[PDB]
Amino acid sequence: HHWGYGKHNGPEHWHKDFPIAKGERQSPVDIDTHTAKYDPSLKPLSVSYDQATSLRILNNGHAFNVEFDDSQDKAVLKGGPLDGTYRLIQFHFHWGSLDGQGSQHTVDKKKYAAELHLVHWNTKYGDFGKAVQQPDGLAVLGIFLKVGSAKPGLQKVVDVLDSIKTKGKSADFTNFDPRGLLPESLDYWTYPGSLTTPPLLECVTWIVLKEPISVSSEQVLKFRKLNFNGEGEPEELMVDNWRPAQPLKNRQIKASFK
Ligand SMILES: [Zn+2]
Numbered sequence: 130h131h132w133g134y135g136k137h138n139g140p141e142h143w144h145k146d147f148p149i150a151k152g153e154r155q156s157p158v159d160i161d162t163h164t165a166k167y168d169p170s171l172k173p174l175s176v177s178y179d180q181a182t183s184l185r186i187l188n189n190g191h192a193f194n195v196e197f198d199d200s201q202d203k204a205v206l207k208g209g210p211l212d213g214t215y216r217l218i219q220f221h222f223h224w225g226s227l228d229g230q231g232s233q234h235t236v237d238k239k240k241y242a243a244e245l246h247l248v249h250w251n252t253k254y255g256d257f258g259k260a261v262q263q264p265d266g267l268a269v270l271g272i273f274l275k276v277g278s279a280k281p282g283l284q285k286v287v288d289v290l291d292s293i294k295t296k297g298k299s300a301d302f303t304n305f306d307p308r309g310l311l312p313e314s315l316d317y318w319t320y321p322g323s324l325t326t327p328p329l330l331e332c333v334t335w336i337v338l339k340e341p342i343s344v345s346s347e348q349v350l351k352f353r354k355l356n357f358n359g360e361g362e363p364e365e366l367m368v369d370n371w372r373p374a375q376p377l378k379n380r381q382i383k384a385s386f387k
Pocket residue numbers: 221222223246325
């Protein structure tokens with residue numbers, strides 16, 4: 130029926146409604162560190178989030194999105210492998226039912242507890258909807274989460290989860306600064322890919338940070354308490370909202386570091 134992460138509508142079935150699932154530039158992938166090519170022509174990333182305006186948080190039935198005002202160049206990403214300015218629209222996570230799984234991307238087959246996705250769209254296309262139809266329409270920063278020490282900057286997000294428990298619920302979520310979720314180093318790997326969920330469009334330049342951020346057990350614990358279902362429907366915990374690694378095919382992963 131409609132796509133999700135269960136046995137009956139899970140990743141292995143998406144291709145029936147989204148044939149691009151079997152495409153040539155699907156995500157996520159396993160990052161083989163010994164085959165990734167250092168490319169010294171890659172520029173340092175430029176993250177300008179000082180004017181970031183968060184507006185809302187929503188449980189859309191497959192994750193929780195924190196949405197930003199993208200009506201202007203307030204929070205942008207540039208540099209790295211990018212040409213042009215990319216505007217932040219929303220961030221969300223992918224996580225597991227257990228600490229040993231949850232991330233999309235893997236590093237030498239290692240899975241992390243979760244993966245944060247900061248989604249940006251190429252301003253040359255004027256709106257998000259047009260940007261997704263272009264090969265260079267989006268730029269996604271992926272940040273791994275390992276369980277260890279608590280991440281202070283994530284707490285405001287954790288505490289509001291109770292109020293958007295089920296699908297379709299939203300809550301005002303202003304004055305959240307995304308800079309509290311960045312690791313210390315901005316070293317990355319990059320490759321041409323796609324959205325990790327339906328519609329799986331091949332419009333993303335992926336920028337995966339080498340350094341993971343740490344979250345406490347209790348923080349990741351609150352993620353696992355959300356529900357995939359709407360209110361008054363049988364309870365299905367939101368967990369394991371991730372997709373297995375896709376073949377690399379004709380692609381090269383480049384590293385900004387050696
Ligand atoms: Zn994602």
